[PDB]
Design an enzyme around this catalytic site. Structure first.
Site, mmCIF file in Angstrom:
data_model
loop_
_atom_site.group_PDB
_atom_site.id
_atom_site.type_symbol
_atom_site.label_atom_id
_atom_site.label_comp_id
_atom_site.label_asym_id
_atom_site.label_seq_id
_atom_site.Cartn_x
_atom_site.Cartn_y
_atom_site.Cartn_z
ATOM 1 N N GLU A 35 -5.964 -12.501 0.548
ATOM 2 C CA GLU A 35 -5.626 -11.841 1.842
ATOM 3 C C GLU A 35 -6.899 -11.413 2.586
ATOM 4 O OE1 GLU A 35 -2.889 -11.751 3.544
ATOM 5 O OE2 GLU A 35 -1.343 -12.243 2.076
ATOM 6 N N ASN A 46 -2.241 -12.050 14.389
ATOM 7 C CA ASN A 46 -1.105 -12.989 14.187
ATOM 8 C C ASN A 46 -0.742 -13.585 15.553
ATOM 9 O OD1 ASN A 46 0.065 -10.425 12.013
ATOM 10 N ND2 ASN A 46 -0.874 -12.325 11.318
ATOM 11 N N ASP A 48 1.947 -13.705 17.067
ATOM 12 C CA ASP A 48 2.949 -12.866 17.778
ATOM 13 C C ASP A 48 2.290 -11.654 18.453
ATOM 14 O OD1 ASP A 48 2.626 -11.032 15.665
ATOM 15 O OD2 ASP A 48 4.745 -10.861 15.239
ATOM 16 N N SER A 50 0.694 -9.188 16.767
ATOM 17 C CA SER A 50 0.556 -8.165 15.718
ATOM 18 C C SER A 50 -0.813 -8.432 15.038
ATOM 19 C CB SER A 50 1.729 -8.182 14.767
ATOM 20 O OG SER A 50 1.832 -9.410 14.059
ATOM 21 N N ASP A 52 -2.995 -7.893 11.111
ATOM 22 C CA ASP A 52 -2.997 -7.556 9.670
ATOM 23 C C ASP A 52 -4.282 -6.774 9.343
ATOM 24 O OD1 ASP A 52 -0.648 -9.077 9.540
ATOM 25 O OD2 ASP A 52 -1.553 -10.663 8.311
ATOM 26 N N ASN A 59 0.762 -5.588 8.069
ATOM 27 C CA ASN A 59 1.059 -6.126 9.416
ATOM 28 C C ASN A 59 1.489 -4.960 10.323
ATOM 29 O OD1 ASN A 59 2.453 -7.424 11.621
ATOM 30 N ND2 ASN A 59 2.360 -9.343 10.478
ATOM 31 N N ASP A 101 10.943 -3.217 -0.703
ATOM 32 C CA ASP A 101 11.828 -3.292 0.490
ATOM 33 C C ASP A 101 12.786 -4.490 0.340
ATOM 34 O OD1 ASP A 101 12.043 -4.133 3.635
ATOM 35 O OD2 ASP A 101 10.199 -5.125 2.888
#
Ligand code: NA
Ligand SMILES: [Rh+]
Ligand SMILES: [Rh+]
Ligand SMILES: [Rh+]
Length: 129
Positions: A35, A46, A48, A50, A52, A59, A101
């Protein structure tokens, strides 16, 4: 801070990640390697809009507020900048909520693609724990 492999493993174990939700320490170390290359300061945008953040590339879409991710949630209730500290406490505490989650470590694309179903014990071999 750029962590050493065994340095990070020891920090993760202390912060309660060893076998958290059944994920061995080698899983968390492998995830961090692919990562962030073990760099607490790592950021990646990202497609979109967003971003990280940090050692586990958490995110802004769901988990943290960075002031520039419109219509996103802040489920770890932190500024995304908190995830870039040389102290990994905020990254670890947020990772615990993510992995709990329902999708487990499949939340981390690098874990699913590079760590899942590999010999992840190799990531902690040699380390004093
Ligand atoms: Na957010
Ligand atoms: Rh610590
Ligand atoms: Rh194997
Ligand atoms: Rh030990």
């Amino acid at each position: 801070k750029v962590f050493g492999r065994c340095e990070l493993a020891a920090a993760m174990k202390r912060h309660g990640l060893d076998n958290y939700r059944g994920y061995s320490l080698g899983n968390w170390v492998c995830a961090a390697k692919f990562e962030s290359n073990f760099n607490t300061q790592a950021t990646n945008r990202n497609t979109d809009g967003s971003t990280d953040y940090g050692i586990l590339q958490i995110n802004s879409r769901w988990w943290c507020n960075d002031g520039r991710t419109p219509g996103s949630r802040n489920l770890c209730n932190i500024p995304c900048s908190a995830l870039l500290s040389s102290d990994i406490t905020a990254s670890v505490n947020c990772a615990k909520k993510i992995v709990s989650d329902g999708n487990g470590m499949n939340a981390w694309v690098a874990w699913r693609n590079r760590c899942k179903g590999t010999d992840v014990q190799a990531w902690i071999r040699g380390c004093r724990l």
